[model samples]
Target chain A: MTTIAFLGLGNMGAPMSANLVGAGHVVRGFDPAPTAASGAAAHGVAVFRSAPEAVAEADVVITMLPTGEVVRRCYTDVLAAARPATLFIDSSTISVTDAREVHALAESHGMLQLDAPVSGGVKGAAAATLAFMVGGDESTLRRARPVLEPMAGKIIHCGAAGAGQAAKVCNNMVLAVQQIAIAEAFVLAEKLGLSAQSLFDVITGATGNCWAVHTNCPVPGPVPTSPANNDFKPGFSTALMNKDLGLAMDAVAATGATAPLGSHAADIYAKFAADHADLDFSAVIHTLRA
Target chain B: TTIAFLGLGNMGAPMSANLVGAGHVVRGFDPAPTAASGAAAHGVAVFRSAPEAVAEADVVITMLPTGEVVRRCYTDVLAAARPATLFIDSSTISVTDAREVHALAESHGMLQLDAPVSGGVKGAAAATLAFMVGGDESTLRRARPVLEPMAGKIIHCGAAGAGQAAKVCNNMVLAVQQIAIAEAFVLAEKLGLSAQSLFDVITGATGNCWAVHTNCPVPGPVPTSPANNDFKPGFSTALMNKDLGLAMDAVAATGATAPLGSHAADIYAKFAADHADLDFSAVIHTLRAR
Candidate 1:
């Protein structure tokens, strides 16, 4: 079994680390509350004093930090202390440039690195079904396969350097805007006196079809697994969608792309998330529909 | 069977050609001489007036420019046709206008269906356009057997204006999605994601939609997309803005809040004003300009 250094043990990170531990790997986890980090115990984890200390004995280093700045700081310190040639994976969703920067940082210390941003949310992490959109070092990822397989459902190698971040940012922007457009349709359909089921049926059968309408339904009684049936709990959160859209808008501005719809969606979800912390991403649509 | 084919525009010319090819005696009419000449080349009998074209036909079909024209045609002329003329308007119009026409047809004892169609001029030429029909179910059942020659899928949405509603909603979703996809491509470009990389991931994942997967508005993503050919009119920006004109009218009439619908319309209007002949996917250039 490999000894893995797991940094940023929070909701998504903790379960990911615990999944590695559950797979019979010894995990050196660094989080302020490792004891409560998704059952950090005899599954095979030891809490460390600091992130850098956690990386000292690691065969692999995986960071799941929140922001680009935090990941850079942690990576800087951890890279200095980690064993040479450690297989490094950044599972956090950072900006594309920063992802490349962090990849370069790991490579400078002789670490084989990849930026592997994930889809499928916290439940997916806990269930070990998160899909990893990975970039950088194809040969290195092939070697990381065994260690990463248990923590992910699909580890797609997008391309070399920044692609994972690119994919994540693009995917979320498309998703958020699609969700907004879809919610617009649903709200309009209901206003026009068409049944939600009818609109859903028509869309799912035709070009208007989308993940938001077909899979989630946003209004209940269609997809049993959708959060709408359960008072709009997160199939994915508004907060997360808002954060990713923020990243997307940054990318849009940097890329010189006019994404009014994506910008509108970010502004909307940011306020919705801020206003109703309990609501799911689609939750705001329902309230807005009313 | 005799088919009354009204509005011999590029879209109507091919659709009427399909009706004739299916062995129907199509009486085609348009104010434009080029439209009449185009239909004559397809062996359709050309008429000078909407009333003369719609007269002496078992099934009367109209593919017009706007709701006002559709209303005016029936109001001034088609009311004089054979009773139960089976008026099928393939033009995408607002629900309010569609319902008005349907009611007017009912008062005149003519069977009318607001059967706005999908699958553009290409689909028309190929005889594969899907008709989202709104009228009585029995009326659709009566027309379906006759419409079978020119229809891909004849969906009976609901009563009166529902077909128009469904079509507008579907187009709004698609137009909005096209804008979203365009901007996402720009964002991906800025993130150093190759067009192909974005396509593989976006199409392979939940962010997938017809616009990105099929009509991908970027060079190298899909070889046949409008963007590949410097934004030629597979479906022109003028047509999209026309459809959105109908969509926005529906939105305003319903008192519904459709941000992306309006947003997409605004984008397309701005684009169409400058580049009317270019395809709807020209939104990408609009995006990249920023």
Candidate 2:
């Protein structure tokens, strides 16, 4: 019966906190939104007026914030009120530099910390099937796993300090490039007098096989579970993909790494996201067609 | 079976050798004396010209390098072959050229199928290459008995030029995927994620692809991949650059907005100009150097 302080009760946070409560942990949720802190009836969470109030009585602190600055500020407030041995988990998709800074801040005060960024979108959040990539020492992860088990499908200890954020951004950058390349394949198939059936049959088994081609197939009807079959809804949005690739390109620029394809994918996604009212990343195929 | 094997190169020589080993009467022809002699050593009856090799062949199997060579060889040599001779072109060619060859074969009252292959020179030597075939179903049916000697699998992609389409597009996706994988690994390194840790996490998740899991760009993650062996030519960067050139040509033909694919072609071309013989996985080394 560990007491948990949950912060940022927005789209992802709310569902994740619900899972925590369902797992029989006592969850105290706080959010900036006016009615966001309320437990509702199903989750059985307790409402708190502020983050500091929630952290003061908790053994575990979990934050799913929007940005790096908000994460840092939230942790600063939590540390001021929380216990010395509190386990702090920040599962936000922030920059690696910020993650390292936040981790150093937590260690400076003898607090246990894990930078645990996640994949799997809102649907996965509600389904409790998200993959968590953790950046911390192994011993701390051992303590945190039981608590995190309710919300994660996988928990991989990537490396020290900022590795989780690193893995998350880098993974998404690959996905971004792959999705666009898949779009190119499908459109080329259409023009080459090949059926979607044949393209899928060949590419899905050969050297080109990837999640985009097998699961979220950009062409409609090939993969029923794919967003393409359902009007290109948000399995993963172009905006989010663009944002992660931007972070990836940022790391590339700062680290003096070469990522021409990733950078180009970022630019294409940025334009597609801005152009559409709502765009699934898979809708990138339409951009190619146009 | 009287089989004519034309244009023996690294890939073609092995294919012809395998056909000879399969108890077929293979007549091999090539301008490259080295490849021709290599095939001769493996029991293929070496010939002076395409016309002489294809003259009495029941199966005329062409394994040329470029579309132009494939077109010219067929034009200059088809007259020597008997009417209704079965033609199986296993070349990585343009869709337009494939269709033109199909048309030429049809006018000559011949049965033809474009059967471009996946799997590298290693796959060729191992007789484990997957063939993507395009033509009439009956033409493919006729070609299958001959293909089995040198192929692991034969997938009928579609009619006329679809084999070329599938082969070029699949290679494009592979190029795009390889570059993306390299980008992720390099960024992971900069952010302190160990190659093993990052590879394990990303490969099991949505970032999973043939490149990451099978031919991982990093050295230790997948031992058989080129990255572990001084960046040897598992598949050379020069080949990837050539394939990407065809990929861009497809994009241009279809008027597709494949920014990332095009950008990948440009980068690989740049790298290949300096390091033409290195493995395509060596792009990771280039990415990391930045």
Candidate 3:
């Protein structure tokens, strides 16, 4: 069995590491949070005191970290101690530049690297259905596929170096905009004497149809099981979406892309997340209601 | 059988032609001679004035420009039409104006429905437009058969102004979604992700929406999208901007807080200022050029 070291054993990481263990891999896990570290231990992950210690005897190292800074800090602490040619996969959603930097850093340390950011939230993590957007050489991806398969529902080889992060930022930016737009429309519909259900029926069948309308409807009744119906308990949290938008803005600034609505959406969410960080991103609708 | 069709423009001309084909004795009038003459080719009896056309009509249907013009048409012509005649204004106008017209029509002993439609000019010509009707259930039942030959579906939204409410709300979401998709596509291009790849991933993911799935901002993935056809007017930027303007007006009047909707209105207004004649999807060019 391949020995895999897992870092950042939080809500996403602990479940992912447990899945790797379930798939019969020898998984070593480490986390900064006491609760998460204990949770990893409960999930049958061989808990380690530190990231470097975790990677010392591993064949591959996988990270599901919080931010680029945390991932960079852990990589600095762990890569040199990992066995030479140890494969590295980062499933954290981080900036493209940070991902590319990790790629260069991994090569300098004689490690195979893939920036493999994921979607499909905490439930998907536990259920082992995350869709991974992988960025690296095809051969490196091929080498890492088996280790990835136990945690992934779908995996796409995006392109060189930072493309997974790039694709993710692009996708999430669009999602943020869509969710906010639908919320704003629902607010407008309510004010104009149009029932939420009527507007929902029209938009879902019309050009306004989207995952936001169909699956995560901001209104309560139209999609009875959406986060909005459950008092906006995150299907995906506002805080996370705000963080992704920050990464998107970084890309926009780095690449010089003009994205007026994107920028606007990010700014809107940043404010909404301040008070309702743990709420589902669709609860940004309540701000529109206010 | 006698039906008076006023405003024989691009939408009205074809819609009235369908009425003629449906065995109604259609009389039409247009301020523009070309439009009037164009309707005559489809067997509509052309009249010089709205009053002359609706004088002996059983049903008076109008597909006009602005809410201001719709109100003026009612004041100058429709109010004098036969009492108890059914008036269906298929023009996209303001909720306030639609309600006002309904009140005036009722004062004149007539049944009125604000029945704004979607499906653009092609849908009109193909007689597949989806109508969002606002009136009493009895009035809708009375009007259903007449609307059928020109409608694919008809939804009774609510009381008098609700059809315009639904129309603006749906179009607001659509405009924002189109811009959001365009921004993401442009960002993807700059980030070294192929349009097709991004399209492939997002179409099945949470980023999925009508804008990306049906009216893709980029040229390659969706052949039927206007982006593939030099940005022709499947639905013109001018009209989208006008609808956004209506949405903004409603927001202002109702004190609805709609940050994304307001921002979308601003973005489309800026795009329409330069590219009014282009398809609404062509706003992607604004992002691409920058």
Candidate 4:
């Protein structure tokens, strides 16, 4: 049995770690909050006082923090004490540069590192059916595959260290743009006298159709499972999307690439998140509505 | 029934050729000598001018460059065609002009139908277009078989002029959203995410969309898509900009509030004006690269 250290027991991470424990791994978890620690303990994880303590004697160290700074700090301050040749896996949706830095730091400490950011959200995480985009050495990836299996529906090895993070950002960026576009179409159709349902029927069957039109349909009535049906409760929050878009924009700025529509979308999402931080990103339809 | 076709350009010639191939007597004419001659080579009866082409035809179909040209051609030539003739316009033009043409045709004791097509030049040549038609139900019913021979899908949008309206509205949304998707993907990538991983994540996630996965995915993930090959013109930039301009005009005329769409159109217009010779859909790359 592999001894695994899991850190950051928030909404996504806590459930994920629980699934790991359920899969029969000797999982030790760390969370600063008493409630988070208690929650993981209730899910069969052995709670540790700190991340470094959890890493001690563990064969694998996994982190699911919120930002790059946390991941960096944890790796620098904690993982340094872990045994040499320990398998290090980060499932956080952090920046690619951060992933690279963390990988380098782990390597310096004689650890095998993998960046395995997830795609499936809370529901998927809870069900242990997330999709993982992994970046690491081939042997390291193969070693972590079984550990990640119970938690992920699909796991793709996307080249080296920063690639997992790169894949996530690229995918989310396109998704945001497509969802906004579908919303625009729905709004325009309403303005032109056709009902949202009618436009949905026509466009869905036409070339205009996409995952945005099918799953996250910006309008109500067509897909009952869509966020629109929940009044834009957002299976995914607008604030999170805005944050991702910000990350994407920073990349654009760094690379000297001109993405006009993406920049505009970032501005729009930023405004939406600012105005309605609690609402789902799909609520962008409100802005488009006449 | 004998059909008269005006403006034998790339799309027009192939479409008219389909009609002739389907065993209809098609009288074709174009101001461009080569276009008209090209149609003549396809077994179409060539006419010296649009007026001569429409004079004896039971149906007059015109597919021209812009709203202004379509307006002038229909009012000056096709409106004076045989009484009770069906006037079908397959051109991509403005709704205002379409309405005007319909009114003019009505006054001349003729039935007018506005049927704008989608699926780009390739679809036009393949006779597998999606025709969004607007006019009297009886007129559409009568022309359905003739149009079906050249189109893959058909949607009766509404009464007189709605076809052009739908096309303009749909394309306007398409241009803006496509750019937005590309831009967002670029931004995401800059944030240290992989394009492939991001695509997989968003395709099944809340951020999924048509533009993101299909059509214009920014960069080389989907080999068959436009984004894979340096944003080549699967659907040229000139055409995209033209459609966007039509939508902008409509928005301005109707006093509609579409900040994103308006901004998208302006960008395309600027791109088109600057790169008058480049394909219109190539604007996505320009926006993304920028």
Clashes per candidate (backbone, < 3 Å): 1, 1, 0, 22
> Number of the top candidate by DockQ?
2
lDDT of 4 by residue, B162-254 (tens): 787777766766776566656656555555455665666656655554566676465666677865665566776778888887887777667
List candidate 4 stretches off by more than 4 Å: B49-51, B77-84, B107-109, B136-138, B177-233, B284-290
DockQ of prediction 2: 0.73
Misplaced by over 4 Å in model 2 are: A39-42, B288-290
- Kindly give the stretch of ten consecutive residues in candidate 1 chain A with the minimal lDDT sum: A34-43
Ranking by lDDT: 3, 2, 1, 4
Predicted candidate 1, C-alpha RMSD:
2.2
> In model 3, which regions exceed 4 Å deviation?
B78-80, B288-290
**What is candidate 1's DockQ?**
0.65
A1-290, model 2: which lDDT tens digit per residue?
68999888888888999898888999988888756665322467787878899888888899899889999998887787888889999999988888989999988877899999889988788899999999988999999998889998888888887888988888888888889889888887887678887888888978898899899899887888999888988888887787787788778877877777888888888888888637789898887674
Per-residue CA lDDT of model 2 for B13-126, tens digit only, reads 898888888899999899989888888998888889889999889999898888899999999888998989999999988888899998998799899999988777888999
Best by lDDT: 3
The order of the candidates by DockQ, greatest first, is 2, 3, 1, 4
Proportion of native contacts present in model 4 = 0.44
Tally clashes: model 4: 22
Query: What TM-scores does chain A show, candidate by candidate in order?
Result: 0.94, 0.96, 0.97, 0.97
DockQ of candidates 1 onward, in order? Answer: 0.65, 0.73, 0.71, 0.42
lDDT of 1 at B126: 85
